[PDB]
Amino acid sequence: APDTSVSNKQNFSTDVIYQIFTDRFSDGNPANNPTGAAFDGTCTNLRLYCGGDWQGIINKINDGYLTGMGVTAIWISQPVENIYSIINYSGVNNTAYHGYWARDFKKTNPAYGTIADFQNLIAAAHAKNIKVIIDFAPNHTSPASSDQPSFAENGRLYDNGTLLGGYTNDTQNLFHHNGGTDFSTTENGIYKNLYDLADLNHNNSTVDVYLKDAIKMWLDLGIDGIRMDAVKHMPFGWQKSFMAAVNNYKPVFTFGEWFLGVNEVSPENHKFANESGMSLLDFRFAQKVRQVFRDNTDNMYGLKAMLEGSAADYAQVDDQVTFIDNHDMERFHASNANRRKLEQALAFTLTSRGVPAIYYGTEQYMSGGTDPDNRARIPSFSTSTTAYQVIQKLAPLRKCNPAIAYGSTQERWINNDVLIYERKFGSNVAVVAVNRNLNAPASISGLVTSLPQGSYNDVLGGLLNGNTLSVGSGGAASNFTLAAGGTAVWQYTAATATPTIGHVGPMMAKPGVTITIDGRGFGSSKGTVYFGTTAVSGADITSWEDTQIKVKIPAVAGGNYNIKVANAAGTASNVYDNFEVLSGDQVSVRFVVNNATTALGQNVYLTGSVSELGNWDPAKAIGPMYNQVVYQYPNWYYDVSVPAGKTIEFKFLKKQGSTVTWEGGSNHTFTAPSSGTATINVNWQP
Ligand SMILES: OC[C@H]1O[C@H](O[C@H]2[C@H](O)[C@@H](O)[C@@H](O[C@H]3[C@H](O)[C@@H](O)[C@@H](O[C@H]4[C@H](O)[C@@H](O)[C@@H](O)O[C@@H]4CO)O[C@@H]3CO)O[C@@H]2CO)[C@H](O)[C@@H](O)[C@@H]1O
Ligand SMILES: OC[C@H]1O[C@H](O[C@H]2[C@H](O)[C@@H](O)[C@@H](O)O[C@@H]2CO)[C@H](O)[C@@H](O)[C@@H]1O
Ligand SMILES: OC[C@H]1O[C@H](O[C@H]2[C@H](O)[C@@H](O)[C@@H](O)O[C@@H]2CO)[C@H](O)[C@@H](O)[C@@H]1O
Ligand SMILES: OC[C@H]1O[C@H](O[C@H]2[C@H](O)[C@@H](O)[C@@H](O)O[C@@H]2CO)[C@H](O)[C@@H](O)[C@@H]1O
Ligand SMILES: [Ca+2]
Ligand SMILES: [Ca+2]
Structure with missing residues (x-):
């Protein structure tokens, strides 16, 4: 299979993820809806269940809504069984519709469906070339009060129906009893409770083994990736051991949530992304994109700095998951704002480095403040919006143009309001022009690119007021006007002749595990793969094709290795570093x-x-x-x-x-x- 196939669970760089809050997407099976005070079919009360489920998702995958958009992966709410208590938080009733209040990691949340529903989901998805990612939150169970055991479910933890223990009289010490965090320090946020959520003690063997067993169940069910919740709140060493358990068994693309505020740049965040085995949700990217296209609190020079900086700080910048909003932020689109701001931010994110994620409803211009207003039921399934069309035109490029999935990023023209950048990989180029100024056009002269001489049509077809580009010799573009709020995409693709590695996954594993090396120019006959100076060829190389190689890690000493491949003719590729052999x-x-x-x-x-x-x-x-x-x-x-x-x-x-x-x-x-x-x-x- 090529690097772009739905079967590649190790690389999401060519995909576009659509984030779904299960309960708020589509109720396909009214039979599993909760009842009473825990339910609101009108979805007017946003803290109760509205009835969205796996059947609904299956329905929208089959009726063409997602596939029509060009989405190729979906990230869904945590699937495990959650507490059943309706929690009153000073007047307001709250349910676990969100999926973050786990009670048993080995069972499903019946409101979403049965394990049969889950398997049907995986099947319907895979049948339509869509990968499935699940949210997973092993930091805690649910809200508990150690002295008010009657509160909620006392953070009770079950092992497939068997009571392991609760927060009150935790003699086994399954949880932490260090109070609640004030987020004052990283250590303080790890060993203390997040709000009133019963914090799991991962140093307890029972908890350790239980979670590693639970995740294996889901891997066996066929998931393609994992979104790890609250990674800044669990011990980093335990998490690495957790990633090793996954990778040494059935590796899948994993990315964690490490919240960063505006202008926050964390070195601990960088180290974790570089050494834990998993990548992260790109908060640096998101906060800056909002500052630039949404709140206008920074300009194009600030966007450029974020792009150059991150490319330097993250060893694997192409694995970071990008977004413009999510379930914990105000929706990008404000009711009164010009829609072009959202459209541009989408276009930028979709053609930028990393793995783009789109929060459900974005393409419908949903607005809303913080939790729970940012989690309303999707109003419609219309394919006639400009946002839906932008995604539809751009998402597919990540599959057909490797410069977008794996390329470097280079600024070629810039001012306060305009940014023109180039993505390049092998014999593939993409140039994107964005003018955030909604009132003023800009005169672009002196633009130099790597595009071959000729004329280029805007890939968006003028949807966002883009234009044609005329490139002379030397890649110098003739002068042109970039319309107010204009966005244009130009590209060039051709066969790459030399082996060029674009991606490797997983990034950490013990000898014997099979890793996937994606790129272009590998050729069709088996060549050689090098781990440092050690050469691997023949049988250990389980599959070899022009865009993908599958090979088993040789039994070399634990350590950090550079990877390089050489084609059948002996031509070597570029070096891909930072691979860790456990x-x-x-x-x-x-x-x-x-x-x-x-x-x-x-x-x-x-x-x-x-x-x-x-x-x-x-x-x-x-x-x-x-x-x-x-x-x-x-x-x-x-x-x-x-x-x-x-x-x-x-x-x-x-x-x-x-x-x-x-x-x-x-x-x-x-x-x-x-x-x-x-x-x-x-x-x-x-
Ligand atoms: O009743 C319990 C609540 O639990 C649920 O919250 C989840 C979030 O949805 C997750 O996405 C995630 O988000 C946390 C994040 O992990 C955490 O860091 C924290 O962020 C702080 C940040 O560290 C700090 O630097 C500063 O910037 O303030 C941030 C505030 O966001 O909070 C995020 C939001 O909870 O984890 C939590 C729990 O794991 C659920 O969403 C709620 O509805 C529910 O009330
Ligand atoms: O809390 C971490 C803290 O540890 C060390 O600080 C010590 C310091 O060295 C001692 O002399 C004493 O004053 O107590 C501190 C711990 O409370 C590191 O020196 C420091 O950088 C670090 O923050
Ligand atoms: O011509 C090469 C030159 O192009 C870009 O410079 C732009 C600049 O960004 C604009 O703000 C304006 O000053 O016009 C220049 C074109 O002459 C690149 O930014 C620059 O690195 C490069 O040398
Ligand atoms: O260089 C490897 C070497 O490192 C450690 O030795 C330390 C030693 O313990 C110190 O007392 C000091 O003298 O510096 C040494 C570093 O060279 C390990 O203890 C040793 O086993 C190992 O060979
Ligand atoms: Ca339902
Ligand atoms: Ca914790």
Whole structure:
């Protein structure tokens, strides 16, 4: 299969995701609707169930609404069984229509459907070339009060009908009892409750094993991807061990939610996207796009800076999931605003790097404030809007023009209101022109591109007042006027002759797992794949075609490797870096070091004998460690993903900038568990 096939669960860069709030999309089966005070068929009360389900989605996939738009993946509400209590929050009744108040990760939410409905959903989708992504929220169960056990369902957790435990009298310690977070620090937001949601303790073996088992059930059901909720709120080491469990079993594209506010740029966010095994929802991209096209609080130079910066900060910028709004933000379109603003933002997002996600109803110009006004029932299924048509014209380009799916991004012309950029990959180019100024045209002169000489029709066909482009020799375009609110797309595609790698997935796995390398120019006869200097050819390369290669990871030492391929003729490709070969299956272990006093700005880190611990390289040490919540300074702690059942030697160190002070004595040593978790407690050696 080619890189663009629905069967490619490892790469979403050529796809366009449509985010659906199941309950608010389409009620296809009135029989599973909740009843009484938990239900509102008119969907006037936005905190109750409106009746949307999997049957409805199946209906809209079959009647051509989604396929007509050019959507190729759908991301749906968390499918697991949620609590049944109607929660009164100071006067207002609330239900779990949203899917985020889990009670049992091994069963379905009956309001959405049965497991049979779920399987039918996967089948209907796959039959129409649409991938299915599910929301998954393992940070907590539901709202609980440890002293008012009668409140809601007391955050109760079930294992396929069997009561594991509740928030009140949690003697097993399945949850955290550290209070509620004030979001003051990253550590504070991880080990304390989010609002009143019972926080799961991932250091408890029962919880650890349970979640890893639960996700395997869904993988077996045929899902194509996972959206991980609240990743900034779970231990990073545990999450890596969780991603390893998925990748070492049945890898699927996974991306997490790490909220970023306006103008916020987080280095922790970057590190997590670069090292956890999963990518993230591109909040930096979204906040900036809103500032520029929506609220007008920044201009084109700020958009450019975000594009150049992110391309530098994220090791895999093409895996970040882009959007302009979602269920936790005001809808992009304001009731009174000019529609062209939304249309332009859509066009920009659809032709920009990364994986575009569209929140249901956007194409219908839905408006609404914060939760729950941003979650109204979709008003209609009309294919006659300009927004629907823009998506319909642009979504398909991600499949047919690799420059859009995998290309670099380059600014070719810019002012306060205008941005003209070029996407390029192999012998493929796309040039996009956007003039956010709704009142003034702009005179474009001096535009240079990589387009071959000739004339180019606007791919949008003038839908957004775009025009034809005339390119002379040297790729120099003749002067032209870019209309007020104008948006135009020009492109050129041709066969690529040299092997060019555009994507690799998964990005982290143990030896033996099969990875997918996507790109162009691979040729049709098997060549060679290199992991560092190690060559792999013949049988281990399970499939080889011009746009996709499937190969098993060789048994090399755990570590970071560059990947390169060479065609049958010996021609080598570009290098794709940052691939992590694990030392084996993983387990999450908590390391604790006592009496490690430091000076201000100086932090404690951990290093050791395996690649998962940096292999004694201080530049690769794990940390900085925590010392507020679970243990307090001068005792430090941290949850780390380490190879299961191995005997490891470790040492702690203090780092200030790049200046390091090693622990004295001999290495500490220990053997990792084969499964479940463990906690290692040692004293700092002077
Ligand atoms: O009654 C419980 C509520 O639970 C549900 O909330 C979900 C969201 O829908 C998820 O998408 C996600 O969103 C969180 C986000 O994970 C979290 O970081 C937080 O964001 C903070 C941010 O960290 C901080 O830097 C600052 O910018 O403020 C942000 C506020 O958004 O909040 C998001 C929104 O909840 O996770 C939570 C729970 O996992 C559900 O939506 C609600 O209807 C329900 O009330
Ligand atoms: O001509 C090459 C030149 O093109 C662009 O420069 C534009 C500039 O962005 C506009 O604001 C205006 O000043 O016209 C110039 C065209 O002469 C690129 O921005 C620039 O990097 C490049 O050299
Ligand atoms: O909370 C993290 C904090 O840890 C270290 O700060 C110590 C500091 O070194 C000690 O001298 C003492 O003052 O207590 C602090 C912990 O409360 C790091 O120095 C610091 O950068 C970091 O924020
Ligand atoms: O370079 C690998 C080496 O690193 C560690 O050695 C530390 C040592 O513990 C310190 O006391 C200090 O002398 O710096 C050394 C770094 O060179 C490991 O302890 C050791 O096993 C390993 O070989
Ligand atoms: Ca229903
Ligand atoms: Ca947590």
